Design a protein around this ligand. Sequence first.
Ligand code: VG5
Length: 373
Amino acid sequence: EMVDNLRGKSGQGYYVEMTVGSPPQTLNILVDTGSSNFAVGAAPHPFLHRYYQRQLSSTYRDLRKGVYVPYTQGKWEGELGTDLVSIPHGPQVTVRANIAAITESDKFFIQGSNWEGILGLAYAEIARPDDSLEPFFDSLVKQTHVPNLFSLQLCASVGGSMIIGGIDHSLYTGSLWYTPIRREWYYEVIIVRVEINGQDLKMDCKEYNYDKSIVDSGTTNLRLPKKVFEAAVKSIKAASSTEKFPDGFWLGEQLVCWQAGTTPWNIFPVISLYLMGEVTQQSFRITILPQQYLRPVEDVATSQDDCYKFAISQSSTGTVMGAVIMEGFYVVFDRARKRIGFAVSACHVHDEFRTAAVEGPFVTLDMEDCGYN
Ligand SMILES: CCNc1cc(C(=O)N[C@@H](Cc2ccccc2)[C@H](O)CN[C@@H](C)C(=O)NC2CCCCC2)cc(N2CCCC2=O)c1
């Protein structure tokens, strides 16, 4: 009953239905492995269909403390409190959890996204105002018998599944490969190698993780450190040089469009990210097709064409493996064993020539630690 419990619009996040308060108020909540605060719209806003009414909840408790959360995209401020929370299409449990009631925001809520709140699934270490504000998943595990693990299968309308407390074998094929959670704050991982159509970018592997690499369902793009970004774009340009695009396309400032049904997928390369294994000097790779990193932009005005944004972009805060990377993989956040597992999803991306893949093992001769710090 947890399969197909996520919905979304492309580029706008994936969300799960939740209830807050007593009697229960239903809200759609974006699933975010890149933050650790649970927060809901709690005042009218132009892009909110509905919001949390604390005055109607007899179980609401005010903590008399404000909070401010800035993301890469957007920011909000609100009042901290606690209340009862359920997940109708999740484990049938009720937990009392910290909730930030958002009362002001800037560029956070998205016109027509269908969600009214955000569920930060990462660790206390990055919660605001500080790590004493226990995150939702921690409360769920402490207060119920739910095992300390969840999995995400992310697939304009989109869908997928969040399996809370377990792994659903019907959602993936082949083997699950595990990479260590380096540090419990973000879901921090280590990238050891990057290839563009099988050609190594040939950088010191620390560059891939300058200054951290994270797995983030709340960010859309694959975001890369400047030096890695520039090298990657050069290589993708070279692979695709049968066609020439404006510089603005490569910067995400501009769409690329082709007559409907004629997108030349085959001129764009596959990107392989090699992730650190659980054993010394071993790795595995996840392979990303252009159908993942060229993100379709739905717009009836442009619909004689298929139009796309380049969904790899630059970062000054390390690698972000966003939703564009997670799509078509089954990703297991195995908190109990401090590891992240990847497998090919039941909704994997593939055409008649190429397929997304998770494969290993690979060995490196180079004994260098790829961690930046
Ligand atoms: C799905 C929306 N698309 C979209 C959202 C974000 C974004 O900032 N996502 C946040 C959630 C969200 C979801 C929806 C709306 C706003 C924010 C994540 O939480 C960000 N995760 C990390 C990187 C972070 O900044 N964590 C903070 C650290 C400080 C303490 C709080 C957590 C970024 C992009 N970007 C930015 C450039 C390229 C890209 O894809 C596109």
